[PDB]
Amino acid sequence: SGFRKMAFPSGKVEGCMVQVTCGTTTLNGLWLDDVVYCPRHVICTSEDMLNPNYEDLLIRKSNHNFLVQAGNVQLRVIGHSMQNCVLKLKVDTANPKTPKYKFVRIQPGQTFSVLACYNGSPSGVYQCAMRPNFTIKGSFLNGSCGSVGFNIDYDCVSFCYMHHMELPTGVHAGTDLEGNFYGPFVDRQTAQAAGTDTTITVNVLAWLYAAVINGDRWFLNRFTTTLNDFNLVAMKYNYEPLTQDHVDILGPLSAQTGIAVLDMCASLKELLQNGMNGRTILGSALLEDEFTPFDVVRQCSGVT
């Protein structure tokens, strides 16, 4: 029993964090095999962040300008390239701690763990979600760029995110490990507003199933709804539309608890229309949307 905002164990990812310096800028890099991945803005002069032309800036850099440090030992940079908004620094040594890995680009609503790092050293780990506006509500300070977001299936680390920047609204933007940003964000110091932060409906539904499994049942009502009816209510409350795919994905939780997905939607619809009335669900006073149906099943069954 009990439901915590749980992150994957970070050990496998800790073994990949290195420090990357270019000139006087220092950020984190991800060392997998003989390649160090880092944000390309490491090459920017701190007084040309408004309008950088990365291809031009990169002409002034050589392999020897990128200082890669794993722990207290220096790695030899034998090659460098720019792929979208990341730099790939080929080193002369394969990381002896490289776990089994994949690079995956996630969809909004999907969750992941972030290992926040400063100067190649991990300082903390927490759970995140790719928001429907392609931002992440992370916890990052200056020098956290290059920290990665990941998921783990048994022994395989699926790298999904690398931190690049903070939007003026205190939210975060970054790329997948191929250097492509999530959403419309660009690695430049410019006016970039985030879009509407809608609630991830399927995740709220999953967390209501987690609450039922763990004993919190006061919100279970006598009503049901249809996908179209619920979606009208969800639209009004800036919730993501619920699709038949989400219903199918919620199937195992519906089966375990005996509560039909559409009955839980009606329970959610009443919580939206009436509020919590001073009550709590899994120790929270708001509807939690950063647990996917997969995370709920994993946590509630103990997938290691």
CB 78 within 8 A of CB 91: yes
CB 159 within 8 A of CB 151: no
Which value, in Å, is the radius of gyration of the alpha carbons in the chain?
Answer: 21
| Of 3, 21, 41, 91, the one binding ligand UJ4 by CB under 6 A | 41
Residues 6+ apart with CB under 8 A from 150: 8, 13, 112, 113, 114, 115, 157, 158, 159, 160, 161
Give yes or no: 246 in active site.
Answer: no
CB 27 within 8 A of CB 66: no
User: Using CB under 8 A, which of the segments 5-13, 37-45, 49-57, 223-231 binds a copy of itself?
Assistant: 5-13
**Angle subtended by helix axes 201-213 and 261-274, to nearest 10:** 100
The site string for a copy of itself over 116-145 (x = CB under 8 A, - otherwise) reads xxxx-xxxxxx-x--------xxxxx-xx-
Q: Should residue 142 be labelled a site residue for ligand UJ4 when binding is judged by CB under 6 A?
A: yes
Min dist. Cβ of residue 295 to ligand UJ4 (A): 19
Half-sphere exposure of 29 (CA within 13 A, CB side): 33
Partner from a copy of itself, ligand UJ4, none binding residue 145, C-beta < 5-8 Å depending on class: ligand UJ4
**Distance of alpha carbon 120 from alpha carbon 18, whole angstroms:** 4
| Of 104, 171, 233, 272, the one binding a copy of itself by CB under 8 A | 171
**Distance of alpha carbon 119 from alpha carbon 132, whole angstroms:** 30
Min dist. Cβ of residue 3 to ligand UJ4 (A): 12
Give yes or no: 145 in active site.
Answer: yes
Q: Should residue 187 be labelled a site residue for ligand UJ4 when binding is judged by CB under 6 A?
A: yes
Query: For residues 198-217, which are near a copy of itself according to CB under 8 A?
Result: 214-215
Query: For residues 177-196, which are near a copy of itself according to CB under 8 A?
Result: none
Which residue has tokens 């219903």?
Answer: 247
Alpha-carbon torsion 192, 195, 201, 202, what sign? negative
Q: Should residue 276 be labelled a site residue for a copy of itself when binding is judged by CB under 8 A?
A: yes
Torsion of CA 80, 81, 86, 91, to 10 degrees: -30
Which residue among 41, 163, 172, 246 is the active-site one?
41
Partner from a copy of itself, ligand UJ4, none binding residue 239, C-beta < 5-8 Å depending on class: none
Q: Which residues bind ligand UJ4 (CB under 6 A)?
A: 27, 41, 44, 49, 52, 140-145, 165-166, 168, 187-189
Q: List the catalytic residues.
A: 41, 145
Q: Which residues bind a copy of itself (CB under 8 A)?
A: 1-12, 14-15, 115-119, 121-126, 128, 137-141, 143-144, 166, 170-172, 214-215, 275-276, 278, 280, 283-286, 298-304
